[PDB]
Design an enzyme around this catalytic site. Structure first.
Site, PDB file in Angstrom:
ATOM      1  N   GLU A 128      11.579  -4.830  -2.388  1.00 48.52           N
ATOM      2  CA  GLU A 128      10.017  -4.981  -2.696  1.00 48.52           C
ATOM      3  C   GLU A 128      10.301  -5.527  -4.096  1.00 48.52           C
ATOM      4  OE1 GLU A 128       7.176  -2.057  -1.685  1.00 48.52           O
ATOM      5  OE2 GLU A 128       5.826  -2.367  -3.491  1.00 48.52           O
ATOM      6  N   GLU A 133       0.305  -4.976  -9.939  1.00 48.63           N
ATOM      7  CA  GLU A 133      -0.446  -3.898  -9.163  1.00 48.63           C
ATOM      8  C   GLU A 133      -1.525  -3.529 -10.235  1.00 48.63           C
ATOM      9  OE1 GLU A 133       1.759  -0.423  -7.774  1.00 48.63           O
ATOM     10  OE2 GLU A 133       0.596  -0.638  -5.940  1.00 48.63           O
TER      11      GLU A 133
END
Ligand SMILES: [Ca+2]
Ligand code: NA
Length: 270
Positions: A128, A133
């Site tokens: 990932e 974010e």
């Protein structure tokens, strides 16, 4: 015409190389679309769901109607689901990307306690990259409203073990200005399996080198090598965050993660 024409790529393509756009994962979102009304300009590149049947973490419920476009931008929206939960927008790419690749969005995060993210995840769910974010609301803490998470994960699955870097430089501060207050460019050069560079508004802010990639060898020595899927989404991460209130989720002035464009390039010979 694309929305980014004239804006340089901030990374160096290499000696005797130039940057070439990857058409099948780039989009200006300059069309109108919604559930039941999705044109080829959207469906040839994107699907309004996760990479498999999971409905998301905590109090999240991924839901296709909550991804739509307005003629100029992609809306990743949240809505009230009752009993402490939300419905949550998501798009994933129909085509994969792989290093070397530069990838960037122009976006404005929500005024919510919800996560808003631009990330990659492999089919096997072991690798990932989190290009960004964010968590936009002061109700989740001003510390979080004022910082952007820049990270990656390596996983063992079945059974589950998670690794991400935890250094203080994984949360990027912009002088106290909340990230909810403007559009920014959020980019990453995934240069090779052991090298990531992060760029905000065209400025390099963080480099991740070999020792931080996989110090526990969850990946058996490969680093971040696999072809992978692009994800843009929102999440109600109540495993660690306060729950969104139903009223916050219903407020259509605060409940949309807006993405103006996504662009992706690869280095090629001149
Ligand atoms: Ca646009
Ligand atoms: Na606070």
């Amino acid at each position: 015409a694309q929305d980014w024409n004239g804006i340089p790529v901030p990374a160096n393509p290499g000696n005797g190389m130039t940057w070439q756009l990857q058409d099948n994962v780039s989009d200006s979102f300059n069309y109108t679309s919604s559930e039941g009304n999705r044109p080829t300009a959207f469906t040839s590149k994107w699907k309004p769901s996760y990479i498999n049947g999971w409905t998301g973490p905590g109090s999240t419920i991924f839901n296709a109607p909550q991804a739509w476009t307005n003629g100029s931008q992609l809306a990743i929206q949240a809505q009230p689901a009752g009993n402490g939960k939300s419905y949550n927008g998501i798009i994933t790419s129909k085509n994969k990307i792989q290093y070397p690749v530069y990838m960037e969005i122009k976006a404005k995060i929500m005024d919510q306690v919800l996560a808003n993210a631009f990330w990659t995840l492999t089919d096997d769910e072991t690798q990932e990259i989190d290009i960004m974010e964010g968590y936009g609301s002061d109700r989740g803490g001003t510390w979080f409203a004022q910082r952007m998470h820049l990270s990656h994960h390596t996983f063992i699955r079945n059974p589950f073990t998670d690794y991400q870097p935890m250094g203080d430089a994984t949360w990027y501060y912009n002088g106290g200005t909340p990230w909810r207050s403007a559009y920014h460019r959020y980019g990453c050069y995934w240069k090779d399996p052991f090298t990531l560079e992060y760029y905000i508004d065209g400025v390099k802010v963080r480099t991740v080198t070999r020792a931080e990639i996989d110090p526990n060898n969850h990946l058996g020595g490969t680093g971040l090598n696999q072809a992978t899927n692009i994800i843009i989404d929102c999440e109600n991460q109540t495993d660690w965050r306060p729950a969104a209130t139903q009223e916050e989720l219903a407020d259509d002035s605060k409940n949309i993660f807006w993405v103006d464009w996504i662009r992706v390039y690869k280095p090629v010979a001149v």
